[PDB]
Design a protein around this nucleic acid. Sequence first.
RNA 1: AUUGAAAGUUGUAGUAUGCGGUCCUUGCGGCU
DNA 2: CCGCAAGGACCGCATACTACAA
Lengths: 322, 331, 330, 184, 152, 146
Amino acid sequence: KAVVFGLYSITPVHAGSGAELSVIDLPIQRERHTGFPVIWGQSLKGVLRSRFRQLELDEKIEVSQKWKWKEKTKEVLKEKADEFIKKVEERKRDPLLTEIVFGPATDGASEHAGAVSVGDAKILLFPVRSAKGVFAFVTSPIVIQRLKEDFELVSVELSNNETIAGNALILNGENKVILEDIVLKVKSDSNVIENLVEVLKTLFGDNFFGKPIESIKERIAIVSDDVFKSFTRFSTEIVARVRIDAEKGTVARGGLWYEEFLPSDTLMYSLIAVGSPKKENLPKEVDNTQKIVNVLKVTFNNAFLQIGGDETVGKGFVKVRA
Amino acid sequence: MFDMFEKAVVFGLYSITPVHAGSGAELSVIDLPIQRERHTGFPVIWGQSLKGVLRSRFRQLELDEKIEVEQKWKWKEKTKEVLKEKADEFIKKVEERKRDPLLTEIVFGPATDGASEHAGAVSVGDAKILLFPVRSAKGVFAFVTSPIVIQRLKEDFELVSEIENDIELKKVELSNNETIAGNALILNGENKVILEDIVLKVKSVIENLVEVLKTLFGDNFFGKIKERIAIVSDDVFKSFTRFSTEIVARVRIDAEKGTVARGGLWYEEFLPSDTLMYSLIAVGSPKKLPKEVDNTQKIVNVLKVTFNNAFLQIGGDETVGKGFVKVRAGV
Amino acid sequence: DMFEKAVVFGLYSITPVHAGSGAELSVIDLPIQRERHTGFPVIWGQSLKGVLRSRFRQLELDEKIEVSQKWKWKEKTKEVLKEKADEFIKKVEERKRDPLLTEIVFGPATDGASEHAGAVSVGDAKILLFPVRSAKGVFAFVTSPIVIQRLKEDFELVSEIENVELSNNETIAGNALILNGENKVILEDIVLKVKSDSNVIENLVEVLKTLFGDNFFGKPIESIKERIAIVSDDVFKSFTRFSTEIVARVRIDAEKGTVARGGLWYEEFLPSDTLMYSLIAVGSPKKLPKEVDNTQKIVNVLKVTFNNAFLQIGGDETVGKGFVKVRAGV
Amino acid sequence: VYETSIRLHRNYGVPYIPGSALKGVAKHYAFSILARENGDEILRIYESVKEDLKEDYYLTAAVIQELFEKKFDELGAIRNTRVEIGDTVISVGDIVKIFGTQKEEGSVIFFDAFPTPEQLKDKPNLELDIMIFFLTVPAGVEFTFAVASRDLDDLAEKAEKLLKEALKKFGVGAKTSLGYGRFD
Amino acid sequence: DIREIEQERASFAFKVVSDIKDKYSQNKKVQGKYSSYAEKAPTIILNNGLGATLAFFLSKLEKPIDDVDYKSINPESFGNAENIAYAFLYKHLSTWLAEGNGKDSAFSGLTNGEDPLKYIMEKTAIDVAISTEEALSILNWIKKFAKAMLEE
Amino acid sequence: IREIEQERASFAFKVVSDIKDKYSQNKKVQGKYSSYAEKAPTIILNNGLGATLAFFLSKLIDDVDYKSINPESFGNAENIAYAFLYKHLSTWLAEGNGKDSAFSGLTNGEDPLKYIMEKTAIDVAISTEEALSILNWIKKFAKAML
RNA sequence: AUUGAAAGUUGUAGUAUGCGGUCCUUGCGGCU
DNA sequence: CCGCAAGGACCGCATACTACAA
């Protein structure tokens, strides 16, 4: 089985990519083939693992009872339990359920594999400033086609000057939408936006991260593939940061650089592919795929996570729907 | 479900002078614009700008033993209490401005030299607009806000609710030509308000919003408003924040000729005074420790006592009287 | 955060003051600076600092700065820059840099901008008392609740560094403004009913006594109290908009002695007897002689240099505009 | 709405003379003396500027103004040219520094002129006159004038002598061609 | 989608200036006078006040400044170019303060249809201040189009 | 938002080249156009787009029509440069690079000044931003060619 | 029974320091 | 009582414009 993780950014997000080619000092992670913003599976998995690990150590994981990992470790590893628990306290290994779900810490890597495969978080809706309705949730046919393909397997035609948009974006009678400083003419369409919303509802539910999904429908703008790509590459936040030499009260030597941010109000999705738990002598309540899936949903549904860098300057916060 | 943090504090920021949180020079008519959220056009102060301001103030207070914890905080003594043997060498680094005093590094993270040792304990959120001052035909000016701002405020309360695990801690629709406004703004016998260059029809929410502002910032509002509160539509509010900021021509005068020098004429943007912004300050467990500040609650207490009712300067142009704000830090 | 001392610079206009904001396509070609959301006249901090800096510079180059003895910058530069002192003096003489103490207080000129920040913060000059023509009492010194509220907040800032409700037809005014047994005051084109109060004006005068003493820019403070009026914010806004000085100026064609084509324009001025104030915050210098090596020393130099001084602010200097009397209240 | 007016001080009501007018009448008087005494030479040296303006006195005065106002970088030719007013020697170069140009502020401050308080007490500062009635300042009213140097050149003395003569020969204010605005 | 008052000011100003040019295309005197009076008007308002300015115009038409409704004034019933222009300017200014650019426009006036001069001599100082600023704003736009369109 | 920049740059290069072509020997005209191009955004910033267009109008009428302007028929450099800048700015807002290009204007052939008087506040704001942007490109090529 | 298992490009970092909307300019001419 | 009814200069210059560990 599999769990679809919806990620909605509430603060700007910097998932750092060193290998990305850019005129920016610190660019964000992007897909090679599409140039779309992305969060790597490995970045997301690290975030998910760290949160899960903290909860397990704090006895806040629920399986519908309180998970006691040291008790479960002893009824699983038996004679080798005490040394394992010692390694956990020594930060050489992670607690039991964490290692079952995400795999052993590097020291014990060869013992068995992690049950989950954490996929890239792919972009779905990208916020763009709109003359009407503050901003639009922008997407493209290539994005919708990717979403549909990912969902169908786990279970549109537009010119560069056209957009399929909700009513709240459209200038009265002019049949136009204005995204930032460019004008797109509205193409008449009946069900494409409606179909998209339905897909979103089928994956994340009635409430769209704290708001009715029907409200989102009025502010969705579907643009051409080239236009969407342009916005995702040139409308992300590019911010100058400095370091001040407080001795002089001026910018220190080598104290100026530029950093890219994925904006807040971005919707992304990651498919979490879950295989069978691979550790030997599993406790009964987590001995198969469905049980791992269930724990994943309860633990992360409606959760708040921090993804990427710049945590202490308020970046990377997302709402999660699983 | 926000278990990475344990407590949070809202930092209310009220400007008493114009504020220039800068983003750098542009090839444009406005040479030096203020910081803005690009996809909404709303003015902001990035968390890293605010963190730098908070860090610098906190650091100076700790060096001058003005920091209150639970009595006075003697950072050198507490340093010796924690680092023990190699404490003397650490203090020498601080005096050489290589490292920062103990509590400063615990809260905000180590100076750049010790960056790899541990992360900072607090998360300084971007400051966002809550009330924006707009000139009014009647009542001089209005504190303007909008549903999308009110909504973002409620959502931030949900963040605080999730962090503090307080479920107890957790509708405005307006046409573009409509407003919900206080009595001081309403023209004599017309049921209309004129803000900037826009006529708005008065609609029959403010009292509730004030009660919310009274929760975060206490019974008094930064030592001072319902009569001049105006709620307008999201797009009208957006246009105000983007086109009703102060745009000022500045010059450099040749000290001998009394005339404008070359490369001495530019336009600079300022967030107006009487602007209310707020930042969410999340606090997690310290990652570096003395008993006085070994957990989240103790760090929160230090933050509250240190910055509540204090004055800060944010952004550039401090020397020409810009960026002065009053802070209210409530839980 | 290094600000340990704050001094208030009182600015009392002797001649009309034009702090310009650029030309506009309207009847008033050259308007004065105003705060946008209130419409209140102001002098931006940068406008005031440039004048203070210019004055301080001219006084330092003429050895007229006292620190209670004379200040020699060339000698103090030799003690500070040592080997590179002769190079720095050549820069100042070539107007590429400014003299030592000027750069310490106000910050370096362009060439040395990144070396260190200025030691002082020159606040925006805010309106405190606006002169309004009065039927009785010749003219009144008028303020408003917003102004008083801002004055109060600025004091909460100063003390931190050093470590009234009126309707549109009401006024709190001194006796010299009130019509004989009518309990009414007439200010410009506005008739106001006197509101009985016994604290607002008194406390306001006490504030001015704390700052400027009994000497209120050439007159006893008691004389002013009888002509102080507080009005509503709306009324004060109307005064500062429609009771500024609007002056028609021309340029004469020497050919016929007539107004040249496009030789007629209007300029706006703050009237004489306008009281404005600016918060001057002082912190530890960041560049330095031991005479001026801390906050308290800089403050003492700022006070004595500018207290009771006559300063020109804004434009039209050579036609006699912008001259104010300065009081430095510590 | 009166169809006529007079500069009265906003706060005190007294009539007064703006520094702009005082500076103006002094500069235009300087234009006059240079034209009557050095008109032929100035019109000959600056024939190019003369063509722009256009051939009598009134053409010379306009040419001198344009030189001082617009083409002041070309005043090197007659910079040493001097004028007497009356026993003091003032050069063209001095006049340039006194009033200044677009490239350099004037070296002399021309303040507003006000009537002494003693006269406000003793005599009428205003009286009605007829052209249509209009307010005037009566003959016999004493005003206090002041000019100040703001440069190391110290040209306030030359400016003072130039202004004094202007107030005698040209006069200030409206209707100078009828004798109004004269000072003794 | 709303409009700003500036848009209505520009619209109204163009309309009234075009109306004069249409009704008096052969009369350069009427056009030249109107432009002169539009240019003069804001200065009179700043020095003497809006009420005195409106009364100043009416006195030129020898109308009783206390007993005249703006709607009753018909500029096309005067002989000399001066009174025609004064009547137009008074009419346009009063119409703006009284009705704006229409009841369904983004600005329908300030006096709610009441004659502006009667309004001034009846209301409070703050009401007059708001109308005074608006009078200056519409006159600024009348001046703009008069300068470009009306001939001398 | 990138293709629109290229369109602006293409227009800007074209109109400045026309200025330099017609008035090659006339440095006064070229210098005047350059100065006005630099001042234009400032006038817009301080007075709004409507007033600025009106200001240009006064430098030239029967009707507000940028098409009917003939810059070369004026007497002095000041009016020639003003008429050209005015027509250039108006042409861009109304026509763009033509209807055979990506950007064909915002006002659909209507004079921008009359357009401002008739349309919504939103329509005016985008026209203001677009006006500032094209002038910003004209300033670039002006400094490099004139 | 797959060169496989396991691993958050993250931590620290104030777009800031210097900079007067200033300089040149008679509300006048006598006309409509 | 009549007439007028802005214009050009400056046009962001300079500095800082990654550092370092893990």
